[PDB]
Symmetry: C3
Subunit: 279 residues, 3 copies
């Protein structure tokens, strides 16, 4: 909403005089904004026709203001009646059956979700962590000890396997968040970080580690590129040869991600994940 956006933009440029004691329109707009984020009714980044993802910067600014509005406090519920110390509440703070019923996702103990992360109906949260401003769309599977970092956009039917980490991107304002598009399968122990994008229907194997510094290599040609996995890619862990050692015909090889197949919606629908990864 246009009024909220206006209040947040002005407030953020005046943020040095926003603090735990602030009330009025600024506290209300920031509060409302994070509520809208929590319900997925607005999102940090959205895909345009043009097929690219655009940042809604005012939403990152709302999140940043909430740090100023909200105090560090003792947060009960640790082992032996002990406590934590932080300034971000659980998404599930005060939730009863009414709220869980309405949201329609599964939240397995002891998963952690911070307020302002949207979890869509039919998502399954195994013990895992979903950070501020994230958007986890319908039917997503967030497996054990996975992580959905700040502002991260996780598509419909995405499977984040055990120990998969999707890196957070809050600051800078302009910086696009990490994006896993609709219907990707991401194998166990993989990491995608730093505003990298995995396009729709891709299949990553285990131990695929993509950040802004990772060579993503075309199997056919050796073409090296960064930051983006094309649609319907099959990507596995591998290496590229390095310089040979003085006077010898061999050297160490270095990690890269390897695109082993550039497939198809049709093919993805006709071919199992394991078939894709095997032959």
């Amino acid at each position: 909403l246009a009024s909220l956006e206006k209040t947040i933009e002005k407030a953020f440029d005046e943020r040095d005089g926003i603090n735990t004691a602030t009330r009025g329109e600024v506290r209300e707009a920031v509060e409302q904004s994070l509520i809208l984020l929590d319900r997925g009714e607005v999102r940090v980044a959205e895909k345009q026709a043009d097929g690219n993802w655009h940042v809604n910067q005012w939403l990152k600014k709302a999140v940043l203001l909430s740090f100023r509005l909200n105090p560090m406090e003792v947060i009960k519920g640790g082992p032996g009646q002990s406590s934590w110390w932080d300034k971000v509440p659980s998404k599930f703070d005060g939730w009863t059956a009414n709220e869980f019923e309405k949201a329609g996702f599964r939240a397995v103990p002891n998963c952690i979700v911070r307020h302002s992360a949207y979890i869509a109906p039919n998502a399954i949260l195994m013990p895992s962590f979903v950070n501020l401003g994230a958007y986890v769309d319908k039917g997503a599977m967030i497996d054990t000890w996975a992580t959905v970092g700040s502002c991260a956009q996780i598509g419909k039917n995405v499977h984040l396997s055990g120990g998969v980490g999707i890196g957070g991107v809050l600051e800078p304002m302009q910086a696009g968040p990490t994006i896993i598009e609709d219907n990707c399968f991401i194998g166990a122990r993989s990491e995608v970080v730093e505003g990298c994008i995995v396009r729709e229907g891709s299949v990553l194997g285990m131990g695929v580690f993509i950040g802004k510094s990772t060579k993503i290599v075309d199997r056919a040609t050796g073409e090296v590129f960064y930051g983006e996995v094309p649609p319907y890619s099959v990507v596995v862990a591998g290496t590229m040869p390095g310089k040979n050692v003085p006077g010898e015909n061999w050297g160490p090889s270095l990690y890269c991600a390897v695109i082993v197949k550039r497939a198809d919606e049709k093919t993805r629908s006709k071919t199992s994940i394991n078939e894709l990864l095997r032959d």
Copy 2:
């Protein structure tokens, strides 16, 4: 027990009329069955003389019925008196010192174990997750942020190192669970999934990722195979060369597991893990 098995088989074929309101013999048999699973008095898969693992399908059917019998509910105990939302209780629900004394394992906060997973005496659960129907045998070490997936069979004295994930296998009925046999050491960040089997006394290094699609390669010959690590194997992360790039003598290499040594009970008893992995 034979009566329980009979009640469960009939109930499972009639499962569409089993729900949270079901009581009588069906609720009792399912309940008893999961209790027997929780105590390790029965198990999802067992090793036969013949040396292979056989699925007790009725036990998978009991677990699947329990989803129908048990409601989604608000589960207290999250941060700031917040709650979770799921239909599987903690193994430790209502446990006092009597139950922990009898079971004889160590449960470090904030590990999570779902009811129907057997944890044997002298096991150590660091913060970790053990899923339904798992069987964790005597003296097993389940290190921090490890995962023991549904129905997984973990042998005596097995060491699952930090961040090691053992994949769950519930459906299909016939599908064998992931099996780590007696006295295996599994190095940090490794994953074994999808009904793959690591045979007795094997030593896996760090980042060894075995699923049904992973090439497990014999170091001596290049022989490629799938799904099973032989007894007393020493297995490390590696690669195999791919196709060379157009007109060149080189190409990218792809991840595989590499069997670097096919050893011995004697040798495993005489040789340290690090010695095995080093030379």
Copy 3:
């Protein structure tokens, strides 16, 4: 303090008659010692001029005595009012705002820290695990599902990325703990274990797995070594070629860590992590 050290040394050699019922000077000295560890006023290992790390063995002995002094007990606070079963209390046991205020670190639910681990001001604990006797120095970032193992020494401004595990070293007495020196960046999914040392200002990429058995390889020469990353190293995941298969010119390659750059304080200050890892 010299008196404490004396009481602990004598007690440890008499440890077979120390138990949950022990009181007097032995209970008090062990208690005080772990309190000093918890506050970082003493540490398990310290860097000498001479530039090497020396073990304070009496502190490892205090920790080991505390196992004898402290009983297994039911520890409340699990899901659905369920409990854990262990003999080590949370660092945060009984902590109010006074204690968190004084310590000055951030403790995000649901991180776990055992009593006797020092967390310095301005550290940030995401959901993670810090074990006994660890020393986490000022401004350290402990990301989600990271692990700081027993006695581990983590330097000032160190960034342990998602899923990074730093291995614990309690016994043997003489064994030096795992050490990450000041200003290291450790990329996601990496593991450093077993008393290995990463020297000051080093940058490890994702999936760098260093233990006592891991070949750490010099990119320029192929020089293979173990246990120590030199200062201002840039280290990435890679491989070294193995024996070729019978009669062929090729074979499988095996995992190693690769030092790709031996840099500089100046260079580290002038060059971003991603620049260092990229070119």
